[PDB]
Amino acid sequence: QIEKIRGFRDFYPEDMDVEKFIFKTAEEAAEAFGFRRIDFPSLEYLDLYRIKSGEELLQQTYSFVDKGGREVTLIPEATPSTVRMVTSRKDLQRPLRWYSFPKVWRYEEPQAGRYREHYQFNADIFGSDSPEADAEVIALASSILDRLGLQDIYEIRINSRKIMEEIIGGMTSSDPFSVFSIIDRYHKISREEFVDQLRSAGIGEDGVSMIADLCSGTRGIDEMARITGKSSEEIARMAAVEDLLASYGVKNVRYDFSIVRGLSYYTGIVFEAYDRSGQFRAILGGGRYDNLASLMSGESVPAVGFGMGDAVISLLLKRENVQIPREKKSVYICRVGKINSSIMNEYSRKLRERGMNVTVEIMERGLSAQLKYASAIGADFAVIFGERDLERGVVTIRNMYTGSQENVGLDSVVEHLISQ
Amino acid sequence: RLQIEKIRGFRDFYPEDMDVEKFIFKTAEEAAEAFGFRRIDFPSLEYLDLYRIKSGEELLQQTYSFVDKGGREVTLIPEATPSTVRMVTSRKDLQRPLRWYSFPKVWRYEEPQAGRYREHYQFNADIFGSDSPEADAEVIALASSILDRLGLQDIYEIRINSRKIMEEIIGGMTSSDPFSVFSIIDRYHKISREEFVDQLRSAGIGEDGVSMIADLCSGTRGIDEMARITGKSSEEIARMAAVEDLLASYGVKNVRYDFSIVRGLSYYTGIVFEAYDRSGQFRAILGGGRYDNLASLMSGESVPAVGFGMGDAVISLLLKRENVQIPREKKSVYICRVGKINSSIMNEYSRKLRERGMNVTVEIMERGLSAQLKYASAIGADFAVIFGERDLERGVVTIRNMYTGSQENVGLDSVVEHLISQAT
């Protein structure tokens, strides 16, 4: 009768087939780009997040007072824990390419694509302030989205905190230099409120006008110099990043002045994989945050990376009807008539030692129920031991898929299956 | 500047650390799945009420618990079973039997005193829906398989006991409550041999049984000896012989009967087992047993259950102790340049190498060749591809075997195929 806290999920086998696929694809891709896995505690002291620029996720922390009187919280994100670890390894030659895939928590109201607990992949490069670093992490994100079977549903949209901190300064020197909070909601709120929020910030008509025009849709990077800022340095960097992206095979990336990102520790490039169908604005996203390390430890460490939650990916995988591949072939071993479990165990052992997943019948059920069960668990083959056929050193192998059956010599069972 | 450290009792896992953890996860998962078990997961937070059925307020004090909005107590899960059981009894379309395994984190609010951690990866494998020898054996076989595949074969010994067995043997020596004696037996490795006897003799046990208990706790016995040592041939001893026989067909031999395994006997309803460390450093590397009554108490629905648990910490110490060599899935390649060379040409080839099953790390920082090779070595790359502008004009690139130290020129057109064939 005791139920699970609402907002949390249970993962039955079929649900985990999907999650595992997400874990495998993310991990294999990251390692292919040279990233190495790390992990950190799931609980931290709340004071860890009391940092200027890292106050966005502190808004929904699953915090509480341990029985020791101190305030703690389930981690809402992985970045600060990762940074604390980075600044503790001055022995490691740069760059540092680390990735993680921990659970993170957030006390928010559930909805299509979000729970209070989820698996979040993270990949970050520490130590390099180069365009190559910005491009590599974005290339890794695309690679993952592609290998997941989502290659045609997203668009890579980029921008930069420098490009957007000078534009709204190359016209309006209004000290509220970071109207960034306003632009972040451009796609959330209505156009009228957006125009007056920025207007009540102390921006002239021409300013509000261009800012609105710049936010409207995605544009080319090359035209950016034109429509504003005659070839600054950050614009040239974005161009370089675009070119570098093409070399990895990543194309159609687009500039979008409305791409800001919620987290406030971003200082350079910011990006998101936009869902072309319009269901999710950010399937994944990240950027460069060259000041977090200093703020937390006093050591300056350039950083660029991104995050990807499992919930939204699960939805897309289903929506786009992706086919989750199956690693090993599974064999279900049945029994009809009087047959010792021992001999079945012996052969299951032999099949396993040759790379196959084998499930043995242990229930006192008939052959009809056995095959029903075999099909219910998705076995690829059914090896049926029959008391009489065993006398003649024969066993029946059924192809659960085709429906085909054949008798097979005991000493040809292993090889016959391996050849399907 | 100063830093807020992580909570005492918790661990950070650096790349080198995760190399070990990944091998444990991978080995456990593949073995479990090879036996037909299927992975599941569940919330890391549950209502504290979920644990009250199987544990008392005393044990429930070591949980990372707290009060929820509606004044409801919730906790970071201290173990996996109650959650797993709740899932078994929350969906009624589930076939039978159910072979499920999980490997999430679990938390325990305990002081860093007893060399442990407040958080660790806990692996659990259980068979639900079958009260048979076959099930008892499969679970134990799976545990052995995992220990052997971890490179820990030869250091552990499977030791089994049984509640029904202990009751028959104790009941035949005294009429008082059996558990009062299980407690003493439970103190066998803590008190003195002289004090042990006194306690056994205070519970109404003659020199007769007192002698058999002391002997039995001093050494393990074969399943055979039991029928005679206890002078009885009950159905329970045959059940264990039946299990031993089934284990043999799985390749699991030298199973021992250990009378002293009594912890949890109030929880378990049938067989219980542990993987004992020969080097006598850890009494139980992993373990479990049958607990056919938990499901009923939790849902009202009767559900036989057998399984075992295994922590990452102790496995981690054993791997180091036995100096186990951990394999590397793929070959690693580092690509760098000397002289002016476009980053794009390096990206192009790393993509081609990755699409061919290799892990590739491209140099993205400005630094001399010597420092680059030092870096390649630090990350354990197997090969380094050196792009030199002059050499590129001639269509060649230098490739060095990071282990041999040698290097050959290779045509761009053959870099991929060349590395693919090279095996260090």
CSV table of C-alpha atoms in Angstrom, one decimal, chain B residues 73 117 169 204 258 269:
chain,number,residue,atom,x,y,z
B,73,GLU,CA,8.8,11.4,6.8
B,117,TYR,CA,31.1,5.5,3.8
B,169,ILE,CA,19.4,-28.3,15.6
B,204,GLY,CA,20.0,-24.8,29.2
B,258,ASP,CA,28.8,-22.7,8.2
B,269,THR,CA,13.0,-17.8,6.0
